[PDB]
Design a protein around this ligand. Structure first.
Ligand SMILES: [Zn+2]
Ligand SMILES: [Zn+2]
Ligand SMILES: [Zn+2]
Ligand SMILES: [Zn+2]
Length: 94
C-alpha cells in the first residue's frame, strides 16, 4: 500500500501469505498464488484489480467484490451498483 494495507486477500476473502500493491490509492493485498504470480514481481507492482478482466488493459471501474475490474469499454453493462450495499458488482456475482 501507499497509505494503509488491509490484512486480507481481496481475491479470496482470506488472510495469509499476502503481497501488497505498491500503487497510491490501493490499500488492498492479495496472495501471489491466487494471482498466478509464478514470476516474482520486482519493484513497483500493480495489482490486476487495475486491469480489465476482459481485455487486460487499464481498468477505469473496479468491481468491489472481485479483482475483475473493467476498462471504459468493458464496464458498460458488465458492472453495476449492488442495491444490497451500494458496492460495484459485476454480472458474474449471481
Ligand atoms: Zn488470495
Ligand atoms: Zn492495486
Ligand atoms: Zn476491457
Ligand atoms: Zn465482481
Amino acid at each position: 500500500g501507499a497509505m494503509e494495507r488491509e490484512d486480507e486477500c481481496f481475491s479470496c476473502g482470506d488472510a495469509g501469505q499476502l503481497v501488497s500493491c505498491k500503487k497510491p490509492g490501493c490499500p488492498k493485498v492479495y496472495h501471489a498464488d491466487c494471482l498466478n504470480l509464478t514470476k516474482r514481481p520486482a519493484g513497483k507492482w500493480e495489482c490486476p484489480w487495475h486491469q480489465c478482466d476482459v481485455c487486460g488493459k487499464e481498468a477505469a471501474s473496479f468491481c468491489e467484490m472481485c479483482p475483475s475490474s473493467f476498462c471504459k469499454q468493458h464496464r458498460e453493462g458488465m458492472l453495476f451498483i449492488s442495491k444490497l450495499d451500494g458496492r460495484l458488482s459485476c454480472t458474474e456475482h449471481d
